[PDB]
Structures are given as structure tokens and as C-alpha cells.
Amino acid sequence: KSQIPRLSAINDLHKIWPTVEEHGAAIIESFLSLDIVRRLNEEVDPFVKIEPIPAAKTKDHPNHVLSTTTRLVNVLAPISKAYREDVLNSKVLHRICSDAFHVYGDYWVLMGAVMELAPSNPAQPLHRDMRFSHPIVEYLKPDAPATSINFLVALSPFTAENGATHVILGSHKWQNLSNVSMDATVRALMNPGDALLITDSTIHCGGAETTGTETRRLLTITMGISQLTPLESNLAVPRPVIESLTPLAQRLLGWASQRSAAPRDIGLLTIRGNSIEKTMNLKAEQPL
């Protein structure tokens, strides 16, 4: 069977979204440089270590879906300089997203999270994303353009043996889900910095960690239209941090009003005809 299409972030930028639109998946080679992967890893390292189990009883909003061998940490902006500056302003990310979401309008981050899988982490069931947070998406028409996409960035090597992600190519167009089998999958073998890009309709799953020794880590960036509510909030991020960001990064984190693609768009998160950033005189690019 055919493998996931591989593309250059450098030479094939315009080809990335068309490829996903057709096959439901693509691997973007060197989506993040090794320098950014390295800095990102240093910055999130301690936060993944302290993270309790997904359904820890201390939690207000426990995650009962992820395995006990999974650690997920989100709201990455206050944690990671590399995240807030390099990845939130990614030229490649923003081209793909504008290609993807132009029919709808503005987009933002629904969730940016580092996921680390412990040795012997079992495979996830084959699934589509967004079903534990946005029931609305199941009521969209089959042909509606994707309202969210997910960049699964490798922060350590993805191998067949250490649980590299599985995808079913073309599955984003499936309606009848009775050929859903692991038999129909191909793997996303990736070096750190490579990214598997999928849509919210692409059938996929994290793979089984078989070695009992390797730890797999990824940065999952779910980008979605500004008409959908993010899974995470940046409301509690200190203002000096927010004010250190670019206007674009501020918008991505819900610290700006948003716009739809309606010809006479009246806007989202406005305040009596004016933006959030104007009203609160939110500054931008003020270093710490």
C-alpha cells in the first residue's frame, strides 16, 4: 500500500495543504529545525515530568481518555520561549493554515500540547480527533472543509517499534466506518522536527510502544477556525508574557478579537465595535 506523502517545508510549501486535502495526511520534513526542537524540549522537560496522570483526582477537568502512561501538558506559552516565539510565528504553519481555513476566516490554536508516552504505552484506538470536546463537528456535512487540523510534531524519533503514529490514507473522506482496521494503516516514521499533518476527519492512532525502553515525545498543535472554542485557555497567562508576543501570536492565543470570512464580517470577541487589543491597549513585542 501507498505511504504517507513526504514534503519539504522549504521547497514544497504550496503543495502541503493540497496533499492533505487529497490523502488526509502528509509528513512535513524539518517542520521545526533541530535548534527549535532542542530548545522546546529543554523548556517543557520539567513540566512533563511533574504532570500527573490524565485523570488525576486533583484535577478540575480530568482527562479519562488518555492512558495512565501518557503525560500531556498544554498552555505552552508561559512555559516555552521557543513555542511562543518560533512555533506560534511559524511561516510554514501560517501558510498551511491560511490555505486550509480561508473559506471560514481567522484561525487560532485550539490546543498546543506536548505529549510524552512512557515505555510500553499501548496503542490508542483508531479515532478522529475533536470528539471528546466538540460534538458540533460530528454534525457538519461530510464535504464541509475541515474546521481543524493537527500538526503532530516529533520531538524524538518516531519508529515502528516505539509507537509511531498510524494513519489510514483517504480516511478523512470516509463516511461508513466498518473498514476501520489496523490492517488499513501506514506509519509516520519521523525524525525530530518532522511533522505529521492530519485533519479532524483523518482516522489515526498513536502506536504501541513495543521496546519497553524508549520514550516517545511529540508536540501536537491543533489549529482551528476562530469560530470554534479552544480546548485550552490562555486567560491566566501573565500580561508581560502576552505583551512580549507578536500581534499574530496574541490572536492565536485568544488575546485579540477575530474575524470570519463573511463578506460583511461583523467579527468575533469584539467590544461594541472595537477589538480586544484596542480596548485593553494590549502592547506587543515588548521583550522580557
Ligand X SMILES: O=C(O)CCC(=O)C(=O)O
Chain residues binding its own copies by CB under 8 A are 51-52, 54, 56, 59-65, 73-75, 103-105, 131-136, 139-141, 144-145, 147, 225-233, 235-236, 255, 257-262, 264-276, 278-280
Residue with cell 484596542: 278
Nearer to its own copies (CB atom), residue 34 or residue 280: 280
Nearer to Ni ion (CB atom), residue 129 or residue 209: 129
What is the contact mask toward ligand X in residues 147 to 166, using x (rule: CB under 6 A)? -----x------------x-
Query: ∠212-153-159 over CA atoms, to 5°?
Result: 35
Nearer to ligand X (CB atom), residue 24 or residue 206: 206
Q: According to CB under 6 A, which one of 129, 194, 200, 214 is a site residue for ligand X?
A: 129
Q: Which three cell numbers stand for residue 174?
A: 470516509
Among all residues, whose Cβ is closest to ligand X? 206
**Element of type H or E holding 92:** helix 91-101
Q: Contact between 129 and Ni ion (CB under 5 A)? A: yes
Shortest Å, Cβ 241 to its own copies? 14
Residue with cell 473559506: 103
Residue with cell 463573511: 262
Query: ∠6-7-11 over CA atoms, to 5°?
Result: 160
Q: Whole-angstrom Cα distance, residue 27 to residue 29? A: 6
Q: 94 labelled as ligand-binding?
A: no
Q: Which three cell numbers stand for residue 51?
A: 504532570
Nearer to ligand X (CB atom), residue 152 or residue 169: 152
Q: Are the C-beta atoms of 113 and 74 separated by less than 8 Å?
A: yes
Kindly identify the residues of this chain, within the stretch 164-223, that bind ligand X according to CB under 6 A.
165, 204, 206, 218
* 132 to 62, 66, 118, 158: CA distances (angstroms): 12, 11, 23, 25
Nearer to its own copies (CB atom), residue 27 or residue 242: 242
Reported as half-sphere exposure (CB side, CA atoms, 13 A), residue 80 has a value of 27
Q: 60 labelled as ligand-binding?
A: no
Residues in touch with ligand X (CB under 6 A): 124, 129, 152, 165, 204, 206, 218
Residues in touch with Ni ion (CB under 5 A): 129
Report the binding-site residues for Fe cation. 127, 129, 204
